[PDB]
Amino acid sequence: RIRIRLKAFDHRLIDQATAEIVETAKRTGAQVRGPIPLPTRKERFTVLISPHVNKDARDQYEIRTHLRLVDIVEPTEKTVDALMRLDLAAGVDVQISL
């Protein structure tokens, strides 16, 4: 009933953090849809490295941001507070749309 869309840069972190966000829900709400991954946005910035001439030495960079969905089933007040108010993992965005 409530879309839980959460974003973070590390994949071993965003996917660790999705294990407890349903463990704090299935303990009380006892019904979640399931962990849905989403296609990651890879932003590339390839740019020069020398402070002058030699525009042939560049270094390819990439910042990968990931997205996960769990889309919890039950809108019972107990479950609502156990997710909305209880947000964990600093450095991990989580945004909810009921």
């Binding site: 007040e77 609502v80 108010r85 947000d87």
Partner: protein, 154 residues
């Protein structure tokens, strides 16, 4: 000419009082002395003879008329009778939850688990009657949808 009067019944048996009143009229056949019966108070179109007064108070589960005195009870001092019907109909049709959370306006939450929290309405939906406002939970503004009445304009 038949003027209106107010009858008090045992509150809860009011439809049965109205039916028994119509039946007592058609028993004691004073048909020219009663016009209607409107529905804890029962409105009666009536005239005032002491016979019809004893008739209405001999109807069962009826306490008595409500007026200035019990000798000559009082017709209808309309002060807000029309206002009653008007406001009842208006509310029944629809309420008046003025879109409190407007696009780009801070709001206040007093309902659900987000009660006692403030936030801003990033998006508004007048068609869906829902305001998109996020409430700083553990610092993280938790974008949640609240109704106009569920939140107050800040």
């Amino acid at each position: 000419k038949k003027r209106w009067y107010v009858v008090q019944a045992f509150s809860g048996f009011e439809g049965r009082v109205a039916t028994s009143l119509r039946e007592h009229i058609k028993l004691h056949n004073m048909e020219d002395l009663f016009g209607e019966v409107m529905v804890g108070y029962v409105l009666v179109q009536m005239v005032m003879n002491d016979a019809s007064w004893h008739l209405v108070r001999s109807v069962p589960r009826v306490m008595g008329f409500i007026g200035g005195t019990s000798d000559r009870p009082a017709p209808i001092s309309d002060k807000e009778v029309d206002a009653i019907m008007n406001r009842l109909q208006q509310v029944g049709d629809k309420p008046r939850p003025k879109t409190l959370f407007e696009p780009g306006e801070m709001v206040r939450v007093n309902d659900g688990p987000f009660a006692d929290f403030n936030g801003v309405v990033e998006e508004v939906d007048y068609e869906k009657s829902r305001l998109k406002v996020s409430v700083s939970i553990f610092g993280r503004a938790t974008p949640v949808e609240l109704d106009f009445s569920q939140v107050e304009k800040a």
